[PDB]
């Protein structure tokens, strides 16, 4: 379950 801070800087592309 390590993974979320990581997904927005993803949505803003």
Do not use: D, Y
Request: net charge positive.
């Amino acid at each position: 379950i390590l993974a979320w801070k990581w997904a927005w800087w993803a949505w803003r592309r």
